[PDB]
Amino acid sequence: REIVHIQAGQCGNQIGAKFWEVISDEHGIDPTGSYHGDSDLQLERINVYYNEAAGNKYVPRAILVDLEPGTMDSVRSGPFGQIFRPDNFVFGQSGAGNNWAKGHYTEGAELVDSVLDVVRKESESCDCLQGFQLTHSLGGGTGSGMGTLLISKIREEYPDRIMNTFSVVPSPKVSDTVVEPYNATLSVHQLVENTDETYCIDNEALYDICFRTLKLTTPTYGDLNHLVSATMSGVTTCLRFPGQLNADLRKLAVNMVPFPRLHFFMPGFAPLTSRGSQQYRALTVPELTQQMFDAKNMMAACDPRHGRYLTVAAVFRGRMSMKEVDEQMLNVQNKNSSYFVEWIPNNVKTAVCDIPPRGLKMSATFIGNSTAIQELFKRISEQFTAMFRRKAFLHWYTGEGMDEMEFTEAESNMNDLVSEYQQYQD
């Protein structure tokens, strides 16, 4: 089973960079070098995220897309800047303007067909394709406009596979681009009709974890991308190793969403410790069962306690007992059982791998869907319609082919997407 990876945007570029720099270390891959796992267990399923060419090189089957050559030139000169086949770099020399419509109408359309050529080269390059990994951000037409333009051509091209969306939704109180939030509405207008799975990521929860719970003072972005890389690495290839009870992307797709409105997801990585001090003899699923289900250790900007739960998708890994999996899950089904909505009896999905990570003895990964994302996209809707009105620095978008009706239909689509969760909270 085979999956490829998409990188759009500078933030998506950094996310993908640290992701490959983690996941190649899990299989034991020297950058120029080869497999070096001391067991054969790291080798048995490497056809997922790699392709053999010469017994030494193992090329990551990935996509390199930006509207600026300097960011990917910084990537290719960095730590693992030799592991990519450089033809996979795809970029125009044009402006990386922050308009969604710049990346979706004109200055993305200059670069769509090359990306389509690369994904048609790499889809049927090898055996049966499984899914697609979209890492991008909403804070740039690189990720917002050209990202949704890519996957909107993909789902008309490939109606079969799974569209993993890794989005960076701008946090409301820490909004580091003042001219941003139109791009969020335009992005989410054409996410909800194309993908199936979106693990929305919010930066302020990462600052909350690494800066409050972890006592590491400096919030260097390498640590943030390191945490997001650990989060996504506790999803896919963890379920593509030997496991006691293993799943795939499609099982979580059938488990989590009620409806085919595809009902966005909240990721979470369980073991978070201060660097050396937090050795504490509290190491089990149980401590991790409690660590996943708090207001922190949740990458949503919204508070996940404030609202119901739809589906707990827990991913466990390490040598462990299933009775003290299901017993802890019954405790979660009984304590918070008020906002754990009752008419779906099992709200839990269990994913068990055999292997630990490289250094840690046991770890877990949480994937969530609550009604609390209503009180994140309502806040984004409020920040949209607040400074939609005065229009005085809105006329950047009009001359790029964007019309007046598109914004309002995007508003209504995102707003009744909020309204269905306004319904199902009760």
């Binding site: 008419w343 009896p345 099992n346």
Partner: protein, 411 residues
Amino acid sequence: RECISIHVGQAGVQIGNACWELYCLEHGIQPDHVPRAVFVDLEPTVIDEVRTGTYRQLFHPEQLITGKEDAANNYARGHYTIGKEIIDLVLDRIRKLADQCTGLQGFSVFHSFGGGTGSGFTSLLMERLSVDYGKKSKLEFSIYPAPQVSTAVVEPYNSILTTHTTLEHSDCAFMVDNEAIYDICRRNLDIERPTYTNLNRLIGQIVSSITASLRFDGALNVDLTEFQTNLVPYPRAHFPLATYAPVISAEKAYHEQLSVAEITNACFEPANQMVKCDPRHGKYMACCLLYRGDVVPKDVNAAIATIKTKRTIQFVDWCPTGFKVGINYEPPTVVPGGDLAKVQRAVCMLSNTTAIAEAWARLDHKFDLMYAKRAFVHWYVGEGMEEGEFSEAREDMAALEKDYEEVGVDS
């Protein structure tokens, strides 16, 4: 003929892994005859477990079947298109095994409901076997859904659609659940790490009490075909409950002044029978036993007497006696990595009760709650289903529970 068997589902494949380890130890099967069964799964990884280290060298590998497509844990997708590409090769391999055997006995089927993958493939597999080899023995064991210890989100819908194919394609059926096996591993095994690798040993222990050294070299046989019309009252394919009693440790449980009658009476104690079908109101219609080890049959026709004279575990009114006594000479066998007892006599049991409809209510109301809001329907529409099959499955369970209402306790 050793009931050439099938296995499907990661539960089914691993439970056959431990069961098959018990098989290849209990006869002194060296790693140098032939494995007399097949392993089929829609994921290659669970099969490549055994195809990597232990028992890869044992097996001729040219006869196990994998599917390179998706896992597809939903009854619609598992029954339909994504499992269509595998069924024919499986049929040709099992007909090769039907040709190489001579005077076979039947089919023991190991799968589960917990996920659509080992359910719909299982369903049309049993359907095609009823077309091909319907004048044979069809025994099926599936792992029953949990009432509240459940794992899959989509846990009901698979089993609800699976209640049709278990009706008109097998006759005897076993549905043992995880929950009270965890209760066994806490209470009577006396460990606090229950992993599936021991539950698989327990089901392998109960099937090794059914079949293997009984049929293979030895002379005191008790027939499978003398079960399938000695365990149903009436030929609606009812659902007996099997229970392996001496689950005590060979480490701490040195109650070594032990006889047959203790575990014999412990075959009828409520909180030990691996399902939530205690005789609170369920009554007994047939309680065929199998003993292995040492038998003074005075213990048999004294334990039967002292159960008969309780008037608390009341039998069926119309069924006068329903017993059949299996006596085998050979003891069970303990795997060195295992945990079982190594006791010179041992008793498994099996019996059909009334209160299976209680677990059916536990599954049925659970189905109807999420059915009421039209919960997950778009996946099953996306692999070609309809509302009418849900309606037929609902009324199928209704007909089954009415049948258990009349022909059971009511006279």
